[PDB]
Amino acid sequence: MDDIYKAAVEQLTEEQKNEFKAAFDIFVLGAEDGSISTKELGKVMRMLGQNPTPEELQEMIDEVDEDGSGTVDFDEFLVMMVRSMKDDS
Ligand SMILES: NCCCCCCNS(=O)(=O)c1cccc2c(Cl)cccc12
Numbered sequence: 223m224d225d226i227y228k229a230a231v232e233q234l235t236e237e238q239k240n241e242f243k244a245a246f247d248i249f250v251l252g253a254e255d256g257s258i259s260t261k262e263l264g265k266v267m268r269m270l271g272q273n274p275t276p277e278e279l280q281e282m283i284d285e286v287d288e289d290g291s292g293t294v295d296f297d298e299f300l301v302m303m304v305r306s307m308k309d310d311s
């Protein structure tokens with residue numbers, strides 16, 4: 223079902239969309255399809271001011287990976303935001 227999630231997707235316009243889509247490119251500016259991993263992860267967090275081990279970051283991808291695949295597609299991705307948004311933690 224996962225409806226309670228699509229409910230928020232309707233709130234998202236299109237201006238804030240181009241903001242995220244632009245991020246993916248970074249996480250995968252040379253990957254085949256666009257599957258993100260602890261590999262291209264620490265790559266973006268580098269521009270900020272962090273650079274932990276791929277073992278710790280996996281924890282962030284293991285929480286959303288509701289299919290155990292070690293990836294973050296534009297799918298389960300939205301969920302992440304919707305969650306932290308409607309409820310930060
Ligand atoms: N660590 C996840 C929290 C996301 C932060 C919200 C802002 N989105 S973001 O561009 O900063 C961003 C950060 C970390 C992982 C991402 C993946 Cl796997 C896909 C797309 C964007 C990602």
Ligand SMILES: [Ca+2]
Pocket residue numbers: 286287288289290291292293294295298
């Ligand atoms: Ca996944």
